[PDB]
């Protein structure tokens, strides 16, 4: 895999990914609810026109985040074993591949004590992210041709699309190219 940095649009969030080849399809970030950077990244107010599904019914991001943290504490092993929930922080990070802003969420599907405690979400190609994006109304972008992203996440090998300098490469070739690019920029590393 790889670790990669996403810059705050307004602080770097380090993610661990086994699919760095899919970087151009990362449409949002997810931090564990406990992640140390959450309180720092929480906006004072919601953006105008925010999707109500993203706000946990909280009047401000800080109120919604406290409510989410309190609510998920009422979950038992049963719930944690078994739907995608979560909350928008009101803030954005920059995707280092395409320079596009992506919204930052917390969600309990991301575990605090594993990897870096944060992920890049690629709904096109990770079913967990696909499910979350469908529930929240987040963009789902195909970057690996081979499947049908309107049906389910496509998790297999294929050919890079919608990925600029990666276009036409296989998954293994694209992983090497993007790690090379991350290293040249000082923004990522290959990691076991
Ligand atoms: C396993 C298939 O994963 C993927 C499959 C397809 C795609 Br496209 C991707 C991309 C976009 N999501 O990145 B994937 O998700 C991250 C990381 O790589 C992967 C690390 O899991 P492995 O340590 O067991 O190998 O799990 C996710 N992960 C990393 N840290 C995590 C954490 N703390 N909590 C929950 N999930 C985490 C991943």
Numbering used by the authors: 313 to 322, 330 to 401, 404 to 513
The authors write:
Leucyl-tRNA synthetase (LeuRS) is a class I AARS that has two active sites separated by a distance of 30 Å, a synthetic site that aminoacylates tRNALeu, and an editing site that ensures the fidelity of translation by a proofreading mechanism. Recently, boron-containing compounds known as oxaboroles have been shown to inhibit LeuRS by the oxaborole tRNA-trapping (OBORT) mechanism, which exploits the ability of the boron atom to bond to the cis-diols of the 3′-terminal adenosine nucleotide Ade76 of tRNALeu. The resulting covalent adduct traps the 3′ end of tRNALeu in the editing site in a nonproductive complex, inhibiting leucylation and thereby protein synthesis. Here, we report the discovery of novel 3-aminomethyl derivatives that have potent antitubercular activity.
The most potent analogs were compounds with halogen substitutions at position 4, bromo (compound 11), chloro (compound 4), and fluoro (compound 6) substitutions, which improved MIC values more than 5-fold over those compound 1. We therefore decided to measure the direct binding of the compounds to the editing domain using isothermal titration calorimetry (ITC) and found that the 4-Cl and 4-Br substitutions significantly enhanced the affinity of the compounds for the M. tuberculosis LeuRS editing domain. This increased affinity is due to a significant gain in the enthalpic contribution (3.1 to 4.4 kcal mol−1), which is consistent with additional favorable interactions being established by the halogen atoms in the editing site. To further explore interactions at the 4-position, we cocrystallized compounds with 4-Cl and 4-Br substitutions in the presence of AMP and solved the structures of the ternary complexes at 1.45- and 1.47-Å resolutions, respectively. The structures showed that the halogenated compounds bind to the editing site without major structural changes, and as predicted, the 4-Cl/Br atoms now occupied the position of the sulfur in bound methionine, allowing van der Waals interactions with the neighboring protein atoms.
